[PDB]
Amino acid sequence: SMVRVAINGFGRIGRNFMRCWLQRKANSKLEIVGINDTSDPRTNAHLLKYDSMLGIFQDAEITADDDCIYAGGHAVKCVSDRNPENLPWSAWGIDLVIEATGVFTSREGASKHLSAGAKKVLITAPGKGNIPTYVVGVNHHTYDPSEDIVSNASCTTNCLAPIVKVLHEAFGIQQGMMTTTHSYTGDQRLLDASHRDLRRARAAAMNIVPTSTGAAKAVGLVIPELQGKLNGIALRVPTPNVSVVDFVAQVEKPTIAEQVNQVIKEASETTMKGIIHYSELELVSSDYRGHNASSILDASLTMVLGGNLVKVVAWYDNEWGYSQRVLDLAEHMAAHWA
Amino acid sequence: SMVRVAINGFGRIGRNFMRCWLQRKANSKLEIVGINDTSDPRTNAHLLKYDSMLGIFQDAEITADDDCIYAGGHAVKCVSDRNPENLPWSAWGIDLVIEATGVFTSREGASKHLSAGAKKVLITAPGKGNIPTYVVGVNHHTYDPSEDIVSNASCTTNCLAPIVKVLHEAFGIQQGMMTTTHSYTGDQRLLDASHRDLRRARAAAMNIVPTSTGAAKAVGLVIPELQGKLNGIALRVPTPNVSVVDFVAQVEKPTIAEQVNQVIKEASETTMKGIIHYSELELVSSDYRGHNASSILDASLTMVLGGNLVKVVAWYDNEWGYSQRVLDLAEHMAAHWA
């Protein structure tokens, strides 16, 4: 039978995920049956259809009433309560919650969905504490069907970890540094304004904005051999979607740029097909809108110094590519539902 | 002695107002003694000093501790309570509150400051309900010293009303339409997200966003003869500050562009000096950052058809010019205090 899904938080990720599922609904073991969000169904149906980044949804009709959003006759019940403990998960027979609010990323927070009756929670963000973390294509086959709360990591970790895994297996990563030049996200202020982070306080579309990030350290959760060996930062810049990881690694086996590219190309054609795409084209960020890969290696930018210092650069659609991976992880959990 | 001022809401207008006052402090009847805001004083001192639009504050040192912001040795007490009824206005001896949160624009809301101990409130926005409204240079001399809650109208009203007054007195305005091509503001969303206004929901730096404006009808509040005779709209565009009003008037006395310009130029040199600036220069929005006028007529753009259809175009720095007018109104109240 279908795994019944509720989305908690109908934001950029919640709505990208919904559109990902609507396009893949024919081959899915998931049925999205509910949404909880701070807004109402009519507003949310409007935003689902009219998206500044994805364009107008035209695969099916999207309508709403007081209680539901309808996506091609398919009814999605809607509620609006900021406290997950109050949500109708038992009443709606919810199996899996996609936790996309950005707020309930700890075990105690995400477990509020379990208290409300859901059987499992998939957090669309790094977990806080000891939450099992997965990157599809890197370690998702280690998923244990008895786990009740899981994390799909961050968009940046999903871009970096597949590349790191391929490079580590070919050359042996000893240490690595990352910078993501990243589109702005909804955690940043539009104009300079109150924020707990003084950098995120600043006008997002007018500035290059550094932030700390756990995304590189988190690769060590999904490639345990590299725990403690990676670190990095983010630079948020004035584009609204699509980001790029710059990764500089100290490797054991001496190499040259041509070999680095061939190793990633080979993986993209075989063990990482659908996860890493390999490109020799001279493209720019707009060209990667809607790309389904977690990582697109920009092969023209690869460089090596002294055999052991390797630079690679990889694009990712931080909204859509990540949401495809959320759906992939959820479909994997559904296929292995005990 | 000095009228003791508290700022409620230390946002774009609250902080622009603070900088306006710091630069005009030598000849002021106002002493800014307190700030209430969502943030703490260290965050707010940082934002007061480091401004993406105004640049780094140069005229005096800005620091903070747990309790105060310090601007050039002047200590400003800080509190953080989102319910104004709880604010320490009695203990701090606050005479005048600058209400710049955007959320206490009705009499019932603004009166919470009076319950807390303040004597008067100046709302930095159109009032909701029966609130006396002033535009400096248009009707501020009508200020009734017995009023306890006043409104300084909107930025667009402050740009449009002086021009309308001059055109009406010279030619007789029968009807008029306005469109402000306006910088985005913090009420809009950085990326598509829920909002009571389905257009303000949409990514602000990516879109031209039509929205309602009461500014045309509010001109009828400050020029009572024109009540019901004006209407218009706003188009929010991807600039972070500085806006432009396009006003098309149906006038009684037939005229031509040269005469319209002569009339506004004469007013800008006499009755409207410091309120309207007249420019024949071929400038763009960035050049009007920090301009102190309420309205800068772009004289090259004036056109008239058939004697009676008049188009004028006027720039305004919606953050800084408006905050200069808030300060002017507060000084006027302080000089007519009862």
Binding site: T101, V103, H182, H195, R196, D197, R236, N318 | D40, S80
Partner: peptide, 22 residues
């Protein structure tokens, strides 16, 4: 702990409080 920090504990989804790891 400041009032602002308590505010972000009570309203973690508020615009002043969002931290997306990116």
């Amino acid at each position: 702990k400041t009032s602002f920090q308590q505010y972000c504990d009570d309203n973690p989804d508020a615009a002043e409080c969002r931290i997306y790891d990116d």
